[PDB]
DNA sequence: GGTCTTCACACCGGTGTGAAGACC
DNA sequence: GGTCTTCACACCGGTGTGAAGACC
């Protein structure tokens, strides 16, 4: 659970434990002795708790302490099962912490979207955790889908085939010259729900925790909307980084460039929304570095100049993230004609 | 020295030792106990040896072993001076190793440029280490300067004021909209020697080692050419990365974009040369990812499409790096009219 | 053609130093 | 206005997992 019950750890199966011993099964070119089972850790720590939608103590806790509970729970479990032999490298802890941050934020926004869709269909406004009720006029067509994308996803297969054909033609034109257009997959995409999914009830129900079935459900939601999204129905793109550095912060920027290059240039979309979430921006000057214009059209001067990234946000709690997502949905879904 | 003499370490002063004890002088928000004196390490290990221009054993040694000798020499010194108390974090070792790689490669190419300039002035062809003599017709005006740039250098102050005025006007036009054009400083720049420096003899003499005076000489060479370089006289840009990762490799690309944006767009330069040097590209697919077109003009189609980065090079030895730089100079300086 | 096995994606936290800073 | 002090730049090496792979 969230507080490391000893009995719960004892009742776990060997393959469900937060730490896997691989001292007799080494990795090819690695010296790792104990590995952090990321999905098992998520199921153990957040199997029945979702931040922002559980108790207030968990809703109002410093969100840096929420992201970090699985790692210390795993360390405690490893100390219990192995003694004087247990050790985990800090780099593995950093990798797992970043992945946990991404997945937990995605789940929180998934529950926010579920509540929004339930309100839009006219089933009411859930009130067990108290949030401001949106003032937008309800309409079934103002429904949103939150997709957490895989690591090596191309993100253009979500588009309708007619909009995919021009992108593929441009890519093949570059390919014929021996060139390419590589990029890293953005973390999360918030889009408008397609017409044929406007009545399905699985976009309206909240999840109780981050169990493995729920992990699979939230990790496979992108396949359902594949090839069904209009270019102009991509409402938000979010990149998550647990901490910032003066050199790493340039990775999302390139992303936010290439995406725009394929949306405002080859499809005529109004403007792409792209923001970065972080928990520790200290030691850098990212609040100024992100006030940077998009590298697109600057060499021509044929259009208005705007920024590559929408904003840098540091959520103090998960309730604040929920409130921000609700306000963004309320302010942006007005542009959709019901 | 290169092989860690004990007597040499004993004869060193306290402030010249490779490791500084800061257990009584902590850093503000850091728990570091022993810090790696990077410049002291460079002076100790390479104070009288420059790879590619010393003995063949050092010239033909695996260049991964050459970059790494200072770190192990420092570890040995720390074990000698402190016992059972000495420990250095791996992250500090990585940072220092990257900086050492950059500085050593810069020094090697500085000596190569010195030999090239000596040949161009007509003083002969040095032969103590045997390299192929360039076949280009000698001419004083085909001389090159190798500048190692600082960490936070803007790199546009090297340009002539007339070419700087348009860049500043473009930057101010973006600034008036609240936008900006930030980028990271490229590591090394090889440019054409200015006219008024065509006879000075400090661009023709090689350095015996990486002593602190020579470190200062090679670190301050950019100030001499500040405000004196034509936009079309920038011949090569080199970024150094000791190892590659699938996410980090995007940092130079953005660089290679922005530079081109300011040279082929606002100054009419023919094409910008920009390459990346690395020692370990395994675990990635960078040889394909760098076969990527520059993000400039793609939205207009008003010019030819080419790649942002010239090539990815993995030097097995320092002699190979010297030979590659000599061949590049021989092939490119022909375009300069003597 | 199932299963076992390897490999690329992207993940980030501890750093040395030049330069802006701050109070005398 | 010298000196002492803090802060942003950029530096990279150890990783869990989904998916391509390879030999039966
Ligand atoms: Ca991701
Ligand atoms: Ca993702
Ligand atoms: Ca991320
Ligand atoms: Ca550098
Ligand atoms: Ca440099
Ligand atoms: Ca570098």
Numbering used by the authors:
A (entry chain A), B (entry chain B): 2 to 339
Task: Please quote the paper that reports this structure.
Each active site cleaves bound duplex DNA containing any one of 17 different 8 bp recognition sites.
For the rest of the work, we refer to the model derived from this sample as SgrAISP/FCA to indicate that this particular structure is filamentous and contains an intact SP, owing to the fact that the cleavage reaction was stalled through the use of Ca2+. In addition, a water molecule ligated to the site A Ca2+ is in the expected position of the nucleophile of the hydrolysis reaction catalyzed by SgrAI (dark blue sphere). The largest difference in stacking surface area of the DNA bases in the two structures is found at the second base step, between Ade2 and Cyt3 (i.e., CACCGGTG), which shows a >250% increase in stacking surface area of the ring atoms in the filamentous form (SgrAISP/FCA). Specifically, the conformation observed in SgrAISP/FCA, containing the SP, brings the carbonyl oxygen of Gly284 within 4.1 Å of the C5 atom of Cyt1 of the DNA (blue).
